[PDB]
């Protein structure tokens, strides 16, 4: 028993492939139903009696449980945001308040030379800014 090196995300693949098997079962059964040979259809009028009032009560309890789970994931994400906000761009505030910076592409660079201050020295002082909270 071994799989293409997926040691996390295996159980999700088990559930999804079980779904793939029963969906291939559906495609199989409706295709062999769709040809007249090997499987056929007969129109039958049959009727059932519901022993309990199933749509009212079943829809009630299932919708309350569904709304319970939805509110759970929503409020869990909400409190994650609360603890999540309670630091990089503050250091970019301080760094830009002392140094000269710019952005090219996705990269954020800075000038280290006195060429803004008047030197014609043939050397550019480009230092990179690296998130690591911040490093140069």
């Amino acid at each position: 028993k071994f799989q293409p090196s997926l040691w996390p995300w295996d159980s999700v693949r088990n559930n999804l492939r079980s779904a793939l098997t029963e969906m291939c079962v559906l495609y199989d059964v409706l295709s062999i139903v769709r040809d007249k040979k090997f499987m056929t259809l007969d129109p039958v009028s049959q009727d059932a009696l519901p022993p309990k009032q199933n749509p009212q009560t079943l829809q009630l309890i299932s919708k309350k449980k569904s709304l319970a789970g939805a509110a759970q994931i929503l409020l869990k994400g909400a409190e994650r945001l609360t603890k999540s906000v309670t630091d990089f761009n503050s250091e970019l505030l301080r760094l830009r308040q002392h140094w000269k910076l710019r952005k090219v592409g996705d990269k954020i660079l800075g000038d280290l030379s006195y060429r803004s201050a008047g030197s014609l020295f043939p050397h550019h002082g480009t230092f990179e800014v690296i998130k690591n909270p911040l490093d140069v």
Binding site: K64, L67, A70, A71, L74, V85, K100, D111, A117
Partner: protein, 112 residues
Amino acid sequence: LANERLRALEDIEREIGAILQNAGTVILELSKEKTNERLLDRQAAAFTASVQHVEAELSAQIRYLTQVATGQPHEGSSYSSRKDCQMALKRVDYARLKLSDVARTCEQMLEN
């Protein structure tokens, strides 16, 4: 500087408030009995007001950023004044070391 940034911080907190108001509204709807239907209407108006003013603040700030963007890297700086301040402080440090040496020779003279 603190103004627009504090606006961005407030919009962070209000995005949290939008998600919490979504969650509280479906919390009240999941209840077996939800007597405070007026409070359900209040939470719904709170949710929609939160989403609407989050949209308002972010649209206004994208407009303001459109007004003051240039695509050019801002050739101003403050380097020369820092350089002169560093030279002034090192002058003071040099004078401190020399005063320590003169005071030490004075202590050697008075010490005998």
